[PDB]
């Protein structure tokens, strides 16, 4: 068995919450995760170090959140030391590294302009290890558990795209199979919230939907055991799995050049 050690940088904890929503599956030895552990303080820190030695180059490091480079790294302190030091220490002997969510993958909200802490994604700090990006704010629960399951079944990272995202989950844009696509194709759009068109489920492009430029499994796998997704519940995609989505203009400003899509 291969242990999974889960670290937390600067984060909101959404990815951890998403992971526990997974229905399929509901395998690992989660021997470190600060949010769950019975032990605290020195006793928690000691648990971390025993696993690294016993399973050298045969544990997985999963990272939620990211390290800040400003404030001498002490805008995120663990055990009186900068988080970046813990991250580098644990990364050194990991077999593989998972960057959970948009925070670890790209920066997410704390890296949006003007980024007061110089929050930096994991792959810009750890450059000599196999990494997999699992972006989204948070990612879909079944995407997170699907990644872990593949890695534990096959003892390797699944096929990645050029941005380091698993092709098994991030190969399609939301817009490809969005159920509102026939409305888009017929020029049938919502123009104001709760207009007649909105009550008929017309396409949300003119309300700012970023589905046409966002890769994720939201339109097919959907959320919370396939209950809904943002568009089905009436709000456009805000682009939350794409690098730098907070700084691509207002969420309610439409994409330019509709004919492209």
């Amino acid at each position: 068995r291969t242990p999974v050690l889960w670290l937390h940088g600067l984060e909101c904890t959404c990815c951890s919450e998403s992971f526990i929503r997974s229905a399929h599956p509901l395998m690992i030895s989660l021997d470190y995760d600060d949010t769950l552990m019975a032990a605290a303080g020195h006793q928690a820190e000691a648990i971390l170090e025993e696993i690294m030695t016993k399973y050298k180059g045969n544990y997985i490091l999963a990272v939620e959140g990211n390290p800040p480079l400003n404030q001498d790294g002490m805008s995120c302190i663990i055990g009186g030391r900068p988080f970046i030091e813990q991250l580098k220490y644990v990364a050194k002997d990991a077999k593989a590294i998972i960057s959970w969510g948009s925070c670890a993958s790209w920066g997410c909200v704390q890296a949006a302009k003007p980024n007061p802490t110089q929050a930096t994604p994991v792959h810009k700090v750890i450059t000599d290890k196999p990494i997999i990006k699992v972006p989204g704010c948070p990612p879909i629960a079944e995407v997170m558990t699907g990644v872990i399951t593949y890695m534990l079944t096959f003892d390797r990272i699944p096929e990645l795209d050029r941005q380091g995202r698993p092709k098994m989950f991030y190969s399609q844009r939301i817009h490809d199979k969005c159920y509102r696509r026939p409305h888009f194709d017929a020029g049938q759009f919502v123009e104001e919230w709760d207009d007649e068109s909105a009550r008929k489920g017309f396409c949300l492009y003119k309300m700012g939907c970023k589905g046409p430029t966002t890769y994720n499994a939201c339109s097919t796998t959907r959320w919370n055991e396939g209950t809904s997704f943002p568009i089905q519940s009436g709000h456009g995609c805000i682009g939350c799995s794409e690098d730098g989505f907070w700084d691509k203009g207002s969420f309610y400003d439409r994409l330019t050049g509709i004919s492209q899509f």
Partner: protein, 598 residues
């Protein structure tokens, strides 16, 4: 050494450090000093993260703000979105339609239940429950205990408990203890018998299974959980009852009601009875520590009005109590510059004048990470933090200069005080409190063959037990309320009102050229506010004061301690190398450190 708020602080004793504090959200360090008999005489709360979300909002569109601030926290997911849309609506004089109000209330109450129940089982329970003792339980006698604690809970057979115990023993014998590795099991701090421990572990597993269903209410109305979508002026989930093309139709509403009904069963049959049982046994052991500020000063903004935009109809009516005088609830006004203020004297920020507290409309967030002269260690390797100087990323909120506790306990104290003074909207929390006191004092002791006690609610409530109890009661009350909200929603739609968004002020060309607003929420952990200033269509200032900011605050200009530090004071520790009691009390606040610092 110095005296403040009736607490005699003294740092001359043995220093103990807990970093990381585990089983919380986010990053916290705690330090204490203990006397010759291992009693806490000093306590130091340090928020060890900051992201700077307030500064990130500057210059952006107020309509987009909710999505940014929602990412303050994925645990209390959506409460910041609600505060934000309320603040913008307040600034721009926007009134939302009834269906949007009810849907927001249902989403809020769903968060309350999820957050409270998952906290208790997933994060708090291990401070009261010894998981290794559960292995020594008799499944038959555990089954018999389950009948006494909650006869209506159908999952009760000896075989059910026996199967749970075996898979725990298997997990334990594997050698891969995972989250149970190097715990404090067998401490004399744990007082439950084996059967009560196995019962709790069993309900842990039930809670973790069911929590994923409850949040589907957010998924229906808001697209996803965590981080459901909100909207300035209403909700995006447009309605057409009788058709499958709109976000909300009758089938989706029936699905929501089914989830609410499940919630009601869990709260009344599992959660509340467990907390009453555990509370009774720790009360019998004499463990009434952890009151801190709850014994004197509590605050909440007030929430859940029966009639939208009519605060006199708040079903959790708020205000402020001082000096433990429960006969005098003072009104709290989030707009008044002399009421809510934040100091940074002992925080890693800077003001022009740090002898002054700033109301959040004039709030300032400029970082200043610097350690005091008495620090043991260096800037990047802290051994012992210097609480005489700046020691936390959390600001210091105060009300008219007073340090206050916030949270479910504060709300329940305030509700009880209101009911005593004639308020007719607080009848249910009063009933819950009186029922709970009778169970803890009399019915549970009678059933377990323990002595009857005579504690009043004024003695029971200001304690770590009381703080834990109030959370469970609040969960129950929130499930009951949203069941009513659902009926009112469906009735309003069936009568012909399908409106979900007011778009009259959507376009920024309609806005006043400058405006300011405040949105408040009774978030799971306490009193939440967002204060916004808008200038020429953009965010000019955005400041958040969050419940864990109140509770986890460091000392202010006058040296007054906050709720966490006060709650740890005067508590004995069985073993100063095992922080069992520290964690038990800290966890009773359900600390959310990302919330606290934002």
């Amino acid at each position: 050494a110095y005296a403040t708020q009736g607490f005699n602080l003294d740092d001359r004793g043995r220093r103990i450090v807990v970093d990381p504090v585990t089983r919380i959200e986010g990053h916290m360090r705690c330090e204490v000093n203990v006397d010759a008999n291992n009693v806490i005489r000093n306590a130091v709360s340090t928020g060890t993260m900051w992201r700077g979300l307030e500064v990130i909002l500057k210059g952006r569109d107020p309509r987009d703000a909710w999505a940014f601030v929602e990412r303050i926290c994925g645990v209390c997911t959506g409460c910041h979105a609600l505060a934000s849309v309320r603040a913008v609506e307040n600034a721009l004089d926007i009134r939302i339609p009834k269906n949007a109000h009810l849907i927001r209330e249902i989403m809020a109450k769903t968060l309350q239940v999820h957050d409270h129940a998952v906290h208790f089982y997933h994060l708090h329970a291990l401070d009261w429950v010894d998981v290794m003792s559960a292995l020594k339980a008799d499944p038959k006698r555990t089954s018999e205990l389950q009948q006494l604690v909650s006869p209506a809970h159908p999952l009760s057979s000896a075989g059910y408990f026996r199967d749970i115990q075996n898979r725990l023993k298997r997990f334990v014998e594997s050698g891969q203890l995972g989250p149970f590795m190097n715990g404090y099991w067998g401490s004399k701090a744990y007082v439950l018998p084996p059967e009560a421990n196995l019962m709790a572990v069993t309900h842990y597993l039930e809670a973790l299974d069911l929590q994923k269903e409850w949040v589907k209410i957010h998924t229906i109305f808001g697209g996803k959980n965590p981080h459901p979508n909100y909207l300035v002026g209403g909700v995006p989930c447009a309605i057409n009852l009788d058709a499958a093309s709109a976000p909300v139709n009758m089938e989706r509403l029936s699905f929501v009601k089914a989830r609410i009904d499940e919630i009601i069963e869990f709260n009344k049959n599992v959660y509340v009875p467990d907390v009453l049982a555990i509370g009774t046994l720790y009360k019998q052991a004499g463990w009434l520590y952890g009151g801190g500020l709850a014994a004197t000063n509590v605050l909440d903004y007030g929430e859940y009005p029966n009639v939208a935009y009519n605060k006199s109809t708040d079903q959790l009516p708020g205000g402020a109590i001082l000096n433990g005088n429960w006969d005098e609830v003072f009104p709290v006004d989030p707009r008044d510059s002399q009421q809510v203020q934040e100091f940074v004297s002992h925080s890693w920020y800077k003001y022009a004048d740090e002898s002054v507290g700033l109301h959040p409309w004039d709030g300032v967030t400029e970082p200043n990470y610097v350690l005091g002269a008495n620090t043991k260690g260096t800037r990047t390797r802290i051994e012992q933090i210097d609480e005489s100087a700046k020691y936390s990323w959390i600001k210091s909120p105060r009300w008219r200069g007073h340090a206050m506790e916030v949270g479910p306990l504060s709300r329940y104290i305030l509700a009880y005080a209101h009911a005593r003074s004639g308020n007719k909207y607080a009848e249910r929390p009063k009933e819950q409190l009186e029922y709970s006191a009778q169970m803890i004092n009399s019915a549970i002791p009678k059933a377990l063959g323990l002595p009857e006690t005579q504690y009043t609610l004024k003695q029971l409530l200001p304690s770590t037990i009381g703080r834990t109890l109030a959370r469970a009661l609040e969960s129950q009350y929130c499930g009951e309320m949203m069941h009513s909200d659902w009926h009112d929603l469906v009735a309003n739609i069936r009568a012909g009102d399908t409106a979900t968004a007011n778009v009259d002020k959507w376009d920024p060309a309609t806005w006043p050229l400058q405006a300011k607003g405040v949105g408040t929420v009774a978030a799971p952990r306490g009193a939440l506010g967002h204060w916004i200033r808008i200038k020429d269509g953009r965010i000019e200032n955005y400041q958040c004061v969050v419940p864990t900011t109140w509770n986890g605050s460091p000392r202010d200009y006058k040296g007054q301690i906050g709720a966490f530090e006060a709650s740890l004071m005067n508590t004995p520790m069985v073993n100063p190398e095992q922080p069992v009691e520290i964690l038990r009390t800290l966890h009773s606040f359900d600390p959310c450190l990302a919330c606290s610092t934002h």
